[PDB]
Each structure stands twice: as structure tokens, then as C-alpha cells.
Structure 1
Amino acid sequence: PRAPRTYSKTYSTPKRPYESSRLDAELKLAGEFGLKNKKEIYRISFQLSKIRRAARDLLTRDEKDPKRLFEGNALIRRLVRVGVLSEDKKKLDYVLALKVEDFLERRLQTQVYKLGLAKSVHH
């Protein structure tokens, strides 16, 4: 028997899946960005919460410690390379304020729309 493979869930079910305001927020986001059933919305929320918690833990550490420093630079570099992080503002603090808006912006359909190649999110 070979070594088992590693798999992890890419989404996180919210603690309260039965309420009004959250549902309104998600439904509006899906409608105005052209998405399928909101499994990817939950996935994006999961990854955003993960990186936000990582950034909070990094900010907890004291300044000039290489432990904190090199992970902070690596995370900032990866996030700004992805593009959800604004190039002008990168101080390990704007990551704690970034929302799912930029992550959904970086999708192929929204990029095509805002470039002007399909004229519609669904198209």
C-alpha cells in the first residue's frame, strides 16, 4: 500500500445557515456578479477568513522578528501577485480589511466583462 493522498475541504458551511441578512448579502453578490449556486461564495469566504486569520496571527508577532517578517512579505507578495491586494497599499493591515469583492473581481468572467469581451456576466 502506497502513501495516502491528502485532501482538504475548500468551503466552510456557516454556523447560521438560516437567516435573512446574510442570505440577502450573498444573493445580491451572486446576482450582481453572475455566479452559480453559492458554493464558490462559501469557498471564497473560507479562503478569505483563512488568510485574514493568518494575517492577524502575523500581526500579533513583534516587529523585526524574521519569523513574522518573511512570512509577512511572502503573504503580501503572493496576494499582490494574485491581484486582490492593492499595489499602492501593502502594509499587512489592508489584508485584514480586504473583502470578497476583489476575490470575485479576479474571476475570469468578471475580468472578461470589465475588459469588454462578452458584455454580460452570464455571457
Structure 2
Amino acid sequence: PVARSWVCRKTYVTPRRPFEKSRLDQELKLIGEYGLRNKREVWRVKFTLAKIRKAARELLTLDEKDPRRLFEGNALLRRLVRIGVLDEGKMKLDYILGLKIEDFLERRLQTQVFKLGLAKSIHHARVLIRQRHIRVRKQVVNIPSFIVRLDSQKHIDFSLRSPYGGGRPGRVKRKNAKKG
């Protein structure tokens, strides 16, 4: 016996059919639209939405005045409004099933650097975040797979230790100045 915790999920599910052009083409468009690394990063969001929809399936089977549906459903409807997926006018549990994969990947940090005009490419943004140039209010975030909350969006900036924000230059601009 030790003092360790052995719990861990798996965060993706490999699909049933390995090779079909309708699926390989439809995953690879989303990789190219959103700068993802491999197919696992598509198979991850698709797996989290496979759980959000499956939990909302069993709530729709219950009685409409069942208190378990009223409490647990109003939490799930709350947790999607805060990450900017559903909306205030559409906060009913029927609409959770009307969600798509790229509804979620609009809220990855890799895409929200690009949509805000900080990066000049969707690929240039995955650079910057891993290059530690991006901060969320005070915190250098080093992961593109970072679901920006709806209040956590309107201030995302250039990480004051960076050459872009606070302006101490890196290795390259120092060595070029060591010649002239």
C-alpha cells in the first residue's frame, strides 16, 4: 500500500472504421482550419462532445420536473455558457444536442490568438503560445488546448517578459547587435 492515486481517463476514442474518405477528409479540414497537430486532437474534442451530448440525452429522458434534471441540467447549461459555446437566449437543454465540433474549437487558445489578430496565422498562433508569449491576465499559458472562458477573453495580451510586450529581445536580436 502506498499514498498514490491511480485514477486517470483516456481523452479520445479511435473510430470504428479506419479508412473512409468521407471521414478522413472531414477531420483533415478541421485540422487545417484550426492548426491541430494530429488526428488525436480531433478525436479529443469529438470525445468530449460525445459525453456532453450523452449526459444531456439521459436528462431528456427524465421527467421535466424531476429535481435531478432541474439541478444537474442547469449546471451543464451553465458550464457551456461560460466557455462561450451556447448563448444566453439559447440556454435550454434541448439545444445542447444542437452543438458541433467546431463550436468548441472556436474557443481553443490557439484559435483565439489568431481571431484577435495577435498572430498573423492560425499556425503562427500555436507557435506563440508554445513560445510563451501569451498570458491570460497574469499567467503565461503554455498550452494551445486551453478553453478560454467568456469573461477570460477580452483581455489576453503579450506576456510582459516577452519581446513583443515588454521588449527585452531574445537571442537573435542580441547577437546581431554584437557585431555592429
Which category of TM-score, normalised to the shorter sequence, fits these structures? Answer: over 0.9
Higher relative contact order (CA 8 A, sep 6+): 1
Letter in structure 2 aligned against 1:34: G
Cα drift, residue 4 of structure 1 = 3.8
Q: For 2:114 and 2:89, how far apart are their aligned partners in 1?
A: 24
Q: For 1:4 and 1:113, how far apart are their aligned partners in 2?
A: 38
Counterpart in the other structure of 2:92: 91
Taking every aligned residue pair, what percent have the same amino acid on both sides?
A: 71
Letter in structure 2 aligned against 1:5: W
Structure 2 unmatched runs, 5+: 125-180
Stretches (4+) displaced over 6 A: none
Aligned residues: 123
Superposed CA RMSD in Å reads 1.1
Structure 1 unmatched runs, 5+: none
Structure that is richer in helix per residue: 1
Q: Deviations over 1:43-86 (max 9, x none)?
A: 10001011101001101101111011101001011111122222
Cα drift, residue 39 of structure 1 = 0.6
Q: For 1:33 and 1:102, how far apart are their aligned partners in 2?
A: 12
Map 1:1-123 onto structure 2 (within 5 A).
1-2=1-2, 4-123=5-124
Q: Deviations over 1:74-108 (max 9, x none)?
A: 10111111222223211101110101112111111
Q: Deviations over 1:16-53 (max 9, x none)?
A: 12111011100011111111112111010001011101
Q: For 1:77 and 1:32, how far apart are their aligned partners in 2?
A: 28
